[PDB]
Amino acid sequence: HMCDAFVGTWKLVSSENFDDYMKEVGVGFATRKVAGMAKPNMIISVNGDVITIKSESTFKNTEISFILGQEFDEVTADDRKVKSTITLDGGVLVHVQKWDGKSTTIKRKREDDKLVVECVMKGVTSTRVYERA
Ligand SMILES: Cn1nc(CSc2ccc(Cl)cc2)cc1O
């Protein structure tokens, strides 16, 4: 019910430090270049307890479906095989991905009419701002 503020179709309007985030994650040069060019839409829906987040771009369409607090396997757009858990903490969707003894966290929050996505890998944060399509 509260997760309703996230539901809809969103379009990327700005990005900061995404290349640096991808470097910290271990993404190679060619994938960074093509992924960094993408202007994805993010489509979020809910059906009962199941949340679906789709990312659609010229680089790589992805779709994850999950229940809050319940681990799932995810193949990321850059082809990492990760174990993911997504929870809703104080109104923020918090997505933790674990692989090869590493961890990254993606937070999605509503701020004004934006959906702000913060991606953190060690000390490196990328901020990506989406608005309604
Ligand atoms: C935060 N984020 N992630 C994507 C998918 S593309 C992607 C590429 C490389 C990495 Cl490391 C993560 C994601 C699009 C977007 O706004």
Side-chain angles (χ1 to χ4, degrees):
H1 252 282
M2 179 268 159
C3 231
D4 285 0
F6 292 103
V7 163
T9 303
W10 301 89
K11 54 176 190 271
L12 184 71
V13 300
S14 68
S15 185
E16 42 191 284
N17 303 297
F18 191 55
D19 190 64
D20 289 334
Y21 168 79
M22 288 190 287
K23 282 183 173 176
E24 208 69 3
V25 168
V27 183
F29 178 90
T31 299
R32 288 202 315 281
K33 297 302 105 175
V34 177
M37 284 289 294
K39 293 291 196 155
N41 300 144
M42 180 175 44
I43 310 88
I44 303 176
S45 60
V46 181
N47 183 325
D49 292 334
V50 183
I51 303 167
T52 300
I53 302 176
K54 293 177 79 165
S55 315
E56 296 186 343
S57 72
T58 65
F59 167 57
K60 194 81 55 179
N61 306 308
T62 64
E63 179 178 336
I64 59 169
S65 294
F66 58 90
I67 296 173
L68 297 167
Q70 301 197 0
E71 185 163 58
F72 61 98
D73 287 311
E74 174 181 10
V75 178
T76 67
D78 61 307
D79 288 328
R80 285 171 290 126
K81 283 59 69 167
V82 309
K83 288 192 181 300
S84 291
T85 311
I86 301 177
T87 58
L88 190 52
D89 302 330
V92 174
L93 279 172
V94 182
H95 181 178
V96 183
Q97 295 179 332
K98 301 299 194 186
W99 80 106
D100 296 338
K102 302 171 181 160
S103 187
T104 188
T105 298
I106 304 161
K107 290 185 182 184
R108 298 172 175 91
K109 61 194 56 138
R110 279 295 307 276
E111 290 183 21
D112 304 314
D113 285 323
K114 301 159 159 36
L115 192 166
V116 180
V117 184
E118 290 171 356
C119 306
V120 178
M121 176 68 182
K122 295 142 90 184
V124 179
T125 303
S126 174
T127 299
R128 282 163 74 86
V129 178
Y130 292 75
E131 285 181 16
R132 295 219 185 249

PDB file of all heavy atoms in Angstrom, residues 1-23:
ATOM      1  N   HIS A   1       0.819  -1.231   0.000  1.00  0.00           N
ATOM      2  CA  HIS A   1       0.000   0.000   0.000  1.00  0.00           C
ATOM      3  C   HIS A   1       0.835   1.255   0.000  1.00  0.00           C
ATOM      4  O   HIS A   1       0.761   2.021  -0.955  1.00  0.00           O
ATOM      5  CB  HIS A   1      -1.149  -0.039   0.989  1.00  0.00           C
ATOM      6  CG  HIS A   1      -2.492  -0.186   0.292  1.00  0.00           C
ATOM      7  ND1 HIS A   1      -3.118   0.858  -0.326  1.00  0.00           N
ATOM      8  CD2 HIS A   1      -3.295  -1.309   0.059  1.00  0.00           C
ATOM      9  CE1 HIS A   1      -4.292   0.436  -0.867  1.00  0.00           C
ATOM     10  NE2 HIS A   1      -4.388  -0.894  -0.652  1.00  0.00           N
ATOM     11  N   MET A   2       1.731   1.395   0.969  1.00  0.00           N
ATOM     12  CA  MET A   2       2.722   2.458   0.858  1.00  0.00           C
ATOM     13  C   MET A   2       3.567   2.312  -0.421  1.00  0.00           C
ATOM     14  O   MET A   2       3.745   3.300  -1.135  1.00  0.00           O
ATOM     15  CB  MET A   2       3.597   2.509   2.088  1.00  0.00           C
ATOM     16  CG  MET A   2       4.673   3.573   2.039  1.00  0.00           C
ATOM     17  SD  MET A   2       6.262   3.040   1.392  1.00  0.00           S
ATOM     18  CE  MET A   2       6.923   4.636   0.935  1.00  0.00           C
ATOM     19  N   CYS A   3       4.001   1.093  -0.801  1.00  0.00           N
ATOM     20  CA  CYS A   3       4.821   0.818  -2.081  1.00  0.00           C
ATOM     21  C   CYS A   3       4.172   1.398  -3.402  1.00  0.00           C
ATOM     22  O   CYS A   3       4.801   1.595  -4.446  1.00  0.00           O
ATOM     23  CB  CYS A   3       5.256  -0.689  -2.193  1.00  0.00           C
ATOM     24  SG  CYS A   3       7.027  -1.206  -2.508  1.00  0.00           S
ATOM     25  N   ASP A   4       2.928   1.826  -3.278  1.00  0.00           N
ATOM     26  CA  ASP A   4       2.222   2.474  -4.364  1.00  0.00           C
ATOM     27  C   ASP A   4       2.920   3.724  -4.892  1.00  0.00           C
ATOM     28  O   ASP A   4       2.774   3.987  -6.075  1.00  0.00           O
ATOM     29  CB  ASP A   4       0.804   2.810  -3.933  1.00  0.00           C
ATOM     30  CG  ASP A   4      -0.104   1.579  -3.899  1.00  0.00           C
ATOM     31  OD1 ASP A   4       0.370   0.456  -4.211  1.00  0.00           O
ATOM     32  OD2 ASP A   4      -1.297   1.739  -3.557  1.00  0.00           O
ATOM     33  N   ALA A   5       3.625   4.494  -4.043  1.00  0.00           N
ATOM     34  CA  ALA A   5       4.330   5.684  -4.532  1.00  0.00           C
ATOM     35  C   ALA A   5       5.427   5.415  -5.535  1.00  0.00           C
ATOM     36  O   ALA A   5       5.876   6.335  -6.226  1.00  0.00           O
ATOM     37  CB  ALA A   5       4.908   6.441  -3.379  1.00  0.00           C
ATOM     38  N   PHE A   6       5.812   4.151  -5.643  1.00  0.00           N
ATOM     39  CA  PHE A   6       6.820   3.739  -6.594  1.00  0.00           C
ATOM     40  C   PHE A   6       6.215   3.234  -7.881  1.00  0.00           C
ATOM     41  O   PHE A   6       6.911   3.183  -8.901  1.00  0.00           O
ATOM     42  CB  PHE A   6       7.687   2.609  -6.018  1.00  0.00           C
ATOM     43  CG  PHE A   6       8.574   3.009  -4.852  1.00  0.00           C
ATOM     44  CD1 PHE A   6       8.273   2.682  -3.540  1.00  0.00           C
ATOM     45  CD2 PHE A   6       9.758   3.699  -5.070  1.00  0.00           C
ATOM     46  CE1 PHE A   6       9.090   3.082  -2.484  1.00  0.00           C
ATOM     47  CE2 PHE A   6      10.576   4.074  -4.034  1.00  0.00           C
ATOM     48  CZ  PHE A   6      10.244   3.769  -2.735  1.00  0.00           C
ATOM     49  N   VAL A   7       4.945   2.821  -7.893  1.00  0.00           N
ATOM     50  CA  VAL A   7       4.374   2.142  -9.051  1.00  0.00           C
ATOM     51  C   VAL A   7       4.238   3.118 -10.200  1.00  0.00           C
ATOM     52  O   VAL A   7       3.786   4.233 -10.029  1.00  0.00           O
ATOM     53  CB  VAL A   7       3.025   1.481  -8.671  1.00  0.00           C
ATOM     54  CG1 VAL A   7       2.181   1.125  -9.894  1.00  0.00           C
ATOM     55  CG2 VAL A   7       3.313   0.262  -7.772  1.00  0.00           C
ATOM     56  N   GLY A   8       4.635   2.686 -11.380  1.00  0.00           N
ATOM     57  CA  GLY A   8       4.454   3.478 -12.578  1.00  0.00           C
ATOM     58  C   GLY A   8       5.610   3.285 -13.525  1.00  0.00           C
ATOM     59  O   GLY A   8       6.429   2.380 -13.365  1.00  0.00           O
ATOM     60  N   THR A   9       5.656   4.155 -14.515  1.00  0.00           N
ATOM     61  CA  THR A   9       6.663   4.125 -15.534  1.00  0.00           C
ATOM     62  C   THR A   9       7.491   5.394 -15.378  1.00  0.00           C
ATOM     63  O   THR A   9       6.937   6.513 -15.318  1.00  0.00           O
ATOM     64  CB  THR A   9       6.024   4.088 -16.928  1.00  0.00           C
ATOM     65  OG1 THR A   9       5.135   2.958 -17.062  1.00  0.00           O
ATOM     66  CG2 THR A   9       7.099   4.032 -17.967  1.00  0.00           C
ATOM     67  N   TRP A  10       8.801   5.220 -15.255  1.00  0.00           N
ATOM     68  CA  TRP A  10       9.723   6.286 -14.933  1.00  0.00           C
ATOM     69  C   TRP A  10      10.788   6.350 -16.006  1.00  0.00           C
ATOM     70  O   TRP A  10      11.188   5.332 -16.536  1.00  0.00           O
ATOM     71  CB  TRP A  10      10.400   5.990 -13.569  1.00  0.00           C
ATOM     72  CG  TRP A  10       9.445   5.843 -12.418  1.00  0.00           C
ATOM     73  CD1 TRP A  10       8.814   4.692 -11.985  1.00  0.00           C
ATOM     74  CD2 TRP A  10       8.988   6.886 -11.561  1.00  0.00           C
ATOM     75  NE1 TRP A  10       7.945   4.968 -10.975  1.00  0.00           N
ATOM     76  CE2 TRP A  10       8.051   6.274 -10.640  1.00  0.00           C
ATOM     77  CE3 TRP A  10       9.265   8.238 -11.435  1.00  0.00           C
ATOM     78  CZ2 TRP A  10       7.420   7.012  -9.639  1.00  0.00           C
ATOM     79  CZ3 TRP A  10       8.634   8.962 -10.443  1.00  0.00           C
ATOM     80  CH2 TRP A  10       7.735   8.364  -9.556  1.00  0.00           C
ATOM     81  N   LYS A  11      11.312   7.542 -16.262  1.00  0.00           N
ATOM     82  CA  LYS A  11      12.348   7.729 -17.266  1.00  0.00           C
ATOM     83  C   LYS A  11      13.564   8.410 -16.631  1.00  0.00           C
ATOM     84  O   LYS A  11      13.443   9.318 -15.808  1.00  0.00           O
ATOM     85  CB  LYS A  11      11.856   8.592 -18.428  1.00  0.00           C
ATOM     86  CG  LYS A  11      11.279   9.946 -18.023  1.00  0.00           C
ATOM     87  CD  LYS A  11      10.896  10.803 -19.231  1.00  0.00           C
ATOM     88  CE  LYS A  11      10.556  12.212 -18.800  1.00  0.00           C
ATOM     89  NZ  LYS A  11       9.113  12.321 -18.462  1.00  0.00           N
ATOM     90  N   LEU A  12      14.757   7.970 -17.001  1.00  0.00           N
ATOM     91  CA  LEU A  12      15.998   8.554 -16.474  1.00  0.00           C
ATOM     92  C   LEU A  12      16.177   9.995 -16.951  1.00  0.00           C
ATOM     93  O   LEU A  12      16.084  10.246 -18.156  1.00  0.00           O
ATOM     94  CB  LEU A  12      17.212   7.718 -16.915  1.00  0.00           C
ATOM     95  CG  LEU A  12      18.543   8.220 -16.322  1.00  0.00           C
ATOM     96  CD1 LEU A  12      18.664   7.951 -14.835  1.00  0.00           C
ATOM     97  CD2 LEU A  12      19.745   7.617 -17.039  1.00  0.00           C
ATOM     98  N   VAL A  13      16.390  10.927 -16.020  1.00  0.00           N
ATOM     99  CA  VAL A  13      16.590  12.315 -16.402  1.00  0.00           C
ATOM    100  C   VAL A  13      17.974  12.838 -16.045  1.00  0.00           C
ATOM    101  O   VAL A  13      18.405  13.762 -16.683  1.00  0.00           O
ATOM    102  CB  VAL A  13      15.487  13.240 -15.927  1.00  0.00           C
ATOM    103  CG1 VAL A  13      14.134  12.798 -16.511  1.00  0.00           C
ATOM    104  CG2 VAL A  13      15.503  13.282 -14.439  1.00  0.00           C
ATOM    105  N   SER A  14      18.690  12.249 -15.092  1.00  0.00           N
ATOM    106  CA  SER A  14      20.069  12.648 -14.842  1.00  0.00           C
ATOM    107  C   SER A  14      20.835  11.509 -14.181  1.00  0.00           C
ATOM    108  O   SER A  14      20.269  10.660 -13.504  1.00  0.00           O
ATOM    109  CB  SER A  14      20.151  13.919 -13.976  1.00  0.00           C
ATOM    110  OG  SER A  14      19.713  13.668 -12.670  1.00  0.00           O
ATOM    111  N   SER A  15      22.149  11.564 -14.340  1.00  0.00           N
ATOM    112  CA  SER A  15      23.059  10.597 -13.743  1.00  0.00           C
ATOM    113  C   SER A  15      24.326  11.299 -13.286  1.00  0.00           C
ATOM    114  O   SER A  15      24.806  12.192 -13.944  1.00  0.00           O
ATOM    115  CB  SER A  15      23.443   9.574 -14.838  1.00  0.00           C
ATOM    116  OG  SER A  15      24.236   8.546 -14.255  1.00  0.00           O
ATOM    117  N   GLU A  16      24.833  10.876 -12.150  1.00  0.00           N
ATOM    118  CA  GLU A  16      26.123  11.341 -11.624  1.00  0.00           C
ATOM    119  C   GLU A  16      26.934  10.151 -11.126  1.00  0.00           C
ATOM    120  O   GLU A  16      26.427   9.320 -10.374  1.00  0.00           O
ATOM    121  CB  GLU A  16      25.925  12.374 -10.486  1.00  0.00           C
ATOM    122  CG  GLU A  16      24.816  12.077  -9.476  1.00  0.00           C
ATOM    123  CD  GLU A  16      24.443  13.222  -8.507  1.00  0.00           C
ATOM    124  OE1 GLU A  16      25.223  13.479  -7.537  1.00  0.00           O
ATOM    125  OE2 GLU A  16      23.307  13.794  -8.670  1.00  0.00           O
ATOM    126  N   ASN A  17      28.190  10.090 -11.538  1.00  0.00           N
ATOM    127  CA  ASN A  17      29.189   9.117 -11.072  1.00  0.00           C
ATOM    128  C   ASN A  17      28.877   7.698 -11.409  1.00  0.00           C
ATOM    129  O   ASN A  17      29.430   6.803 -10.787  1.00  0.00           O
ATOM    130  CB  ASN A  17      29.431   9.256  -9.584  1.00  0.00           C
ATOM    131  CG  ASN A  17      29.858  10.627  -9.248  1.00  0.00           C
ATOM    132  OD1 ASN A  17      30.897  11.056  -9.690  1.00  0.00           O
ATOM    133  ND2 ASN A  17      29.073  11.323  -8.514  1.00  0.00           N
ATOM    134  N   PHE A  18      28.044   7.463 -12.418  1.00  0.00           N
ATOM    135  CA  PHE A  18      27.692   6.088 -12.737  1.00  0.00           C
ATOM    136  C   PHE A  18      28.869   5.318 -13.304  1.00  0.00           C
ATOM    137  O   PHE A  18      29.045   4.112 -13.011  1.00  0.00           O
ATOM    138  CB  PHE A  18      26.476   6.057 -13.668  1.00  0.00           C
ATOM    139  CG  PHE A  18      25.852   4.696 -13.863  1.00  0.00           C
ATOM    140  CD1 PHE A  18      25.435   3.944 -12.774  1.00  0.00           C
ATOM    141  CD2 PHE A  18      25.662   4.196 -15.137  1.00  0.00           C
ATOM    142  CE1 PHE A  18      24.849   2.690 -12.950  1.00  0.00           C
ATOM    143  CE2 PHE A  18      25.080   2.948 -15.310  1.00  0.00           C
ATOM    144  CZ  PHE A  18      24.687   2.192 -14.219  1.00  0.00           C
ATOM    145  N   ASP A  19      29.664   5.956 -14.165  1.00  0.00           N
ATOM    146  CA  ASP A  19      30.866   5.272 -14.656  1.00  0.00           C
ATOM    147  C   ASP A  19      31.808   4.856 -13.519  1.00  0.00           C
ATOM    148  O   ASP A  19      32.308   3.750 -13.520  1.00  0.00           O
ATOM    149  CB  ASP A  19      31.617   6.142 -15.692  1.00  0.00           C
ATOM    150  CG  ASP A  19      32.731   5.352 -16.408  1.00  0.00           C
ATOM    151  OD1 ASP A  19      32.443   4.391 -17.129  1.00  0.00           O
ATOM    152  OD2 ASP A  19      33.910   5.679 -16.217  1.00  0.00           O
ATOM    153  N   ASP A  20      32.004   5.734 -12.558  1.00  0.00           N
ATOM    154  CA  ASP A  20      32.862   5.454 -11.407  1.00  0.00           C
ATOM    155  C   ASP A  20      32.264   4.310 -10.563  1.00  0.00           C
ATOM    156  O   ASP A  20      33.008   3.448 -10.098  1.00  0.00           O
ATOM    157  CB  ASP A  20      33.070   6.718 -10.581  1.00  0.00           C
ATOM    158  CG  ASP A  20      33.956   7.725 -11.273  1.00  0.00           C
ATOM    159  OD1 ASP A  20      34.799   7.374 -12.106  1.00  0.00           O
ATOM    160  OD2 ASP A  20      33.782   8.894 -10.966  1.00  0.00           O
ATOM    161  N   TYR A  21      30.949   4.292 -10.380  1.00  0.00           N
ATOM    162  CA  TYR A  21      30.287   3.195  -9.675  1.00  0.00           C
ATOM    163  C   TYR A  21      30.518   1.884 -10.400  1.00  0.00           C
ATOM    164  O   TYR A  21      30.917   0.889  -9.800  1.00  0.00           O
ATOM    165  CB  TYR A  21      28.798   3.502  -9.519  1.00  0.00           C
ATOM    166  CG  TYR A  21      27.991   2.302  -9.055  1.00  0.00           C
ATOM    167  CD1 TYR A  21      27.984   1.916  -7.741  1.00  0.00           C
ATOM    168  CD2 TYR A  21      27.260   1.547  -9.941  1.00  0.00           C
ATOM    169  CE1 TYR A  21      27.282   0.810  -7.306  1.00  0.00           C
ATOM    170  CE2 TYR A  21      26.580   0.445  -9.563  1.00  0.00           C
ATOM    171  CZ  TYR A  21      26.587   0.058  -8.237  1.00  0.00           C
ATOM    172  OH  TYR A  21      25.861  -1.068  -7.861  1.00  0.00           O
ATOM    173  N   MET A  22      30.317   1.885 -11.704  1.00  0.00           N
ATOM    174  CA  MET A  22      30.503   0.671 -12.496  1.00  0.00           C
ATOM    175  C   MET A  22      31.959   0.202 -12.418  1.00  0.00           C
ATOM    176  O   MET A  22      32.221  -0.997 -12.344  1.00  0.00           O
ATOM    177  CB  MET A  22      30.074   0.852 -13.951  1.00  0.00           C
ATOM    178  CG  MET A  22      28.570   0.943 -14.161  1.00  0.00           C
ATOM    179  SD  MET A  22      28.098   0.878 -15.884  1.00  0.00           S
ATOM    180  CE  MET A  22      28.622   2.487 -16.412  1.00  0.00           C
ATOM    181  N   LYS A  23      32.921   1.126 -12.450  1.00  0.00           N
ATOM    182  CA  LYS A  23      34.319   0.724 -12.300  1.00  0.00           C
ATOM    183  C   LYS A  23      34.530   0.013 -10.968  1.00  0.00           C
ATOM    184  O   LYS A  23      35.205  -0.983 -10.898  1.00  0.00           O
ATOM    185  CB  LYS A  23      35.247   1.946 -12.361  1.00  0.00           C
ATOM    186  CG  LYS A  23      35.501   2.455 -13.759  1.00  0.00           C
ATOM    187  CD  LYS A  23      36.486   3.626 -13.716  1.00  0.00           C
ATOM    188  CE  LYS A  23      36.900   4.059 -15.094  1.00  0.00           C
ATOM    189  NZ  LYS A  23      37.764   5.244 -15.069  1.00  0.00           N
TER     190      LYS A  23
END
